Amino acid sequence: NSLLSLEKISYKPTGKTILDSVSFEIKTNEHCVLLGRNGAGKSTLVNLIYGMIWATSGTIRLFQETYGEIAIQDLRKRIGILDSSQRKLTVKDTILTGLDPSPEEETKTLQILKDSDLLSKKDQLYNTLSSGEKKKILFLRSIVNEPDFLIMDEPCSSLDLTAREDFLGFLKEYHSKKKFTSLYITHRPEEIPDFYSKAVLLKEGKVIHFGPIEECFTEKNLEDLYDIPLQVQRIENTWSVIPKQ
Amino acid sequence: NSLLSLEKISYKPTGKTILDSVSFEIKTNEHCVLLGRNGAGKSTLVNLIYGMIWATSGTIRLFQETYGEIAIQDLRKRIGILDSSQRKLTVKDTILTGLFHTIGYYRDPSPEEETKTLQILKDSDLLSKKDQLYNTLSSGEKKKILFLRSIVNEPDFLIMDEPCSSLDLTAREDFLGFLKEYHSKKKFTSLYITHRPEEIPDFYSKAVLLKEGKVIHFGPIEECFTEKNLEDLYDIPLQVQRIENTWSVIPKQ
């Protein structure tokens, strides 16, 4: 029941090692975080998982299959990506962009909106939604094709506290209602919902540690990651990571 | 010693009220934070304080002079701005781009201007990087240099508009360390704009809380940053506390 597996994955396309012998695994219905500083190689690793770049060594597998065994266009359909960085479309049409509009596709879109108590917004323009609601819609767009797993690339970027809580609340509700698999990418431990049970800590392209999130988020492992003394604790079921004076 | 004052500042350029009757003031050598939700109007307010847009009503003054009494070019010489949006220059060169150009009379830096910039770097223990290219600095270091640039004209006050943008925790610590060190050496006046309470250094003593173009509260920061006033700002139950000399504001479960 391994869904994603990386075994000593490296990426050295032009004499500089960008990813160095990366190993971790995500089982079916698990939720894993990839935590690292700005510039740690997280975007590169996502590119590799999504089949946009080939590893220069190691083995990567989706279920039982090495990436060599799967047509990349088929792999990409089976992996959903939420990343907001991607004139005047509605809620419905924005979601449809994640797949012209076949009827079957339209029905699917409306059901996904209905399952998440947001049908009433079907025709609201996307640009009028609150910042958090926009991310909820991009989440629905990321799962429109019913992927095997979802990559959420810094989905709380540019959300204030209230919007973050709105989005994360929608995530927690989706998780209570539906089994799925995910990899959540961030540099801010406070953006991580309580249902993430596993973590990969990435520093300068190397895994510092992978495993249960309580094992990774020790003071010592986070200090190695951030290179400064830290106070780590849990407050209100969030991770609080604050530099020491 | 009222240095900046806004009295009932409103901005309604085209049927929608973007700022509504904004009132606050900053005295000489005070450090004031503007904490607002995204979309609260913070960028508009900064633009108005920097003379880029005119208020639709109300009064804004630098010391005793209304903005109507000051040539906006002269206003801007007196207000430093640190903004990360506003290209292969050295550190020294980057600081020198901050010099005030009289309209139509741009000139290269004088010998004495070059010397003054080196003194700035020396005073902040960065002379050693004078010739290092700006684009090779760490992300927190770039913000230090932008701060130096912002004070090159010796302004009356400084606006730091989301200065921790693009900084991870380590880079933020680096830059905030530099700010605190600067503050320890020299009295100055500032307005720090953020949407993240954790980005606010300890020397900020006053705050303005902004929501949908309106001031929710203005006063001593401990008065503004009560659970009640922050729950009014953020519209959710919050746990507010101080941890390692930083503000922790965390949603309740």
Side-chain angles (χ1 to χ4, degrees), chain A residues 37-38 158 160-162 165 187-188 190 226 228 230-231 233 235-238 241-245, chain B residues 37-38 166 168-171 173 196 198 234 236 238-239 241 243-246 249-253:
Chain A
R37 290 198 57 182
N38 287 327
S158 310
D160 68 26
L161 184 149
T162 309
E165 264 300 291
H187 60 100
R188 292 194 167 96
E190 64 268 19
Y226 288 108
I228 59 164
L230 297 171
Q231 184 73 220
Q233 60 199 106
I235 296 161
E236 300 288 327
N237 235 52
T238 62
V241 180
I242 292 167
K244 284 188 171 160
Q245 294 191 54
Chain B
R37 310 267 298 268
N38 290 314
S166 312
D168 68 23
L169 177 174
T170 304
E173 269 304 287
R196 290 191 198 262
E198 64 276 22
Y234 284 110
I236 51 167
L238 299 168
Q239 184 72 64
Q241 64 198 102
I243 301 171
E244 301 290 325
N245 221 25
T246 69
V249 182
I250 295 171
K252 296 191 170 157
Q253 61 206 296

Side-chain angles (χ1 to χ4, degrees), chain A residues 26-67:
Chain A
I26 307 178
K27 296 189 168 61
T28 297
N29 297 145
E30 288 187 336
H31 302 280
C32 190
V33 179
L34 177 65
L35 185 67
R37 290 198 57 182
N38 287 327
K42 302 185 304 293
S43 280
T44 301
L45 183 55
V46 166
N47 289 336
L48 190 150
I49 293 165
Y50 197 52
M52 277 170 59
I53 55 177
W54 283 109
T56 62
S57 57
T59 304
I60 180 167
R61 291 182 198 270
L62 184 60
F63 295 110
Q64 293 293 278
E65 298 182 298
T66 62
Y67 272 29

Side-chain angles (χ1 to χ4, degrees), chain B residues 1-85 89-106 108-253:
Chain B
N1 73 349
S2 174
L3 189 149
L4 180 67
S5 61
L6 282 70
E7 297 184 303
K8 298 180 200 301
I9 287 285
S10 279
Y11 183 57
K12 190 187 171 208
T14 64
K16 203 252 192 170
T17 298
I18 298 174
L19 302 174
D20 187 357
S21 191
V22 170
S23 290
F24 68 91
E25 70 130 14
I26 304 173
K27 305 213 178 61
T28 297
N29 299 329
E30 296 190 326
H31 295 292
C32 185
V33 189
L34 177 71
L35 179 68
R37 310 267 298 268
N38 290 314
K42 293 190 311 295
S43 287
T44 302
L45 189 52
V46 168
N47 293 341
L48 194 157
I49 295 166
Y50 201 52
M52 294 276 306
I53 61 177
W54 282 116
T56 60
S57 54
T59 302
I60 173 167
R61 295 173 195 269
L62 181 63
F63 295 110
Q64 289 198 52
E65 291 180 293
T66 68
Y67 273 31
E69 307 165 62
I70 311 174
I72 257 45
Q73 127 183 293
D74 291 334
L75 180 80
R76 300 215 251 249
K77 170 170 199 194
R78 308 164 59 184
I79 302 183
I81 303 289
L82 196 184
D83 82 334
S84 310
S85 33
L89 306 166
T90 62
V91 164
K92 180 198 79 201
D93 290 335
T94 297
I95 299 172
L96 290 164
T97 61
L99 291 164
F100 162 71
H101 323 297
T102 272
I103 289 282
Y105 287 100
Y106 171 77
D108 295 334
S110 71
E112 186 186 323
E113 283 165 356
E114 302 263 340
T115 304
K116 285 174 155 162
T117 283
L118 302 173
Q119 186 69 51
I120 291 163
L121 295 164
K122 190 163 86 199
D123 293 358
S124 283
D125 302 323
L126 290 162
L127 184 62
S128 75
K129 305 190 189 286
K130 67 198 191 50
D131 307 307
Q132 186 184 343
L133 300 175
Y134 174 85
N135 282 337
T136 70
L137 299 173
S138 82
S139 60
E141 291 174 339
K142 288 178 190 188
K143 300 304 178 96
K144 302 177 192 192
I145 295 317
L146 296 176
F147 180 92
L148 297 187
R149 176 179 178 287
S150 84
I151 64 167
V152 81
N153 303 125
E154 300 184 36
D156 291 336
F157 91 102
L158 173 56
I159 302 174
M160 290 180 265
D161 187 8
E162 293 279 8
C164 293
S165 65
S166 312
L167 303 190
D168 68 23
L169 177 174
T170 304
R172 179 178 80 215
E173 269 304 287
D174 190 22
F175 170 64
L176 287 188
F178 162 91
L179 267 185
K180 286 180 123 173
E181 186 137 34
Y182 184 89
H183 176 261
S184 82
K185 290 171 189 181
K186 230 226 149 183
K187 282 180 187 314
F188 70 113
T189 305
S190 77
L191 177 62
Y192 191 99
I193 300 127
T194 187
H195 69 273
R196 290 191 198 262
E198 64 276 22
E199 287 175 3
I200 298 167
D202 72 348
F203 61 84
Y204 281 92
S205 71
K206 301 283 286 220
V208 175
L209 303 182
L210 201 74
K211 186 193 191 182
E212 291 267 72
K214 304 218 254 281
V215 172
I216 286 331
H217 204 264
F218 163 55
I221 194 168
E222 332 84 81
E223 185 180 277
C224 295
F225 283 17
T226 60
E227 167 177 4
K228 196 233 164 208
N229 281 329
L230 294 185
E231 294 177 343
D232 186 13
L233 180 61
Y234 284 110
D235 295 320
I236 51 167
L238 299 168
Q239 184 72 64
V240 180
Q241 64 198 102
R242 280 198 58 93
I243 301 171
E244 301 290 325
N245 221 25
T246 69
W247 290 103
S248 173
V249 182
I250 295 171
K252 296 191 170 157
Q253 61 206 296

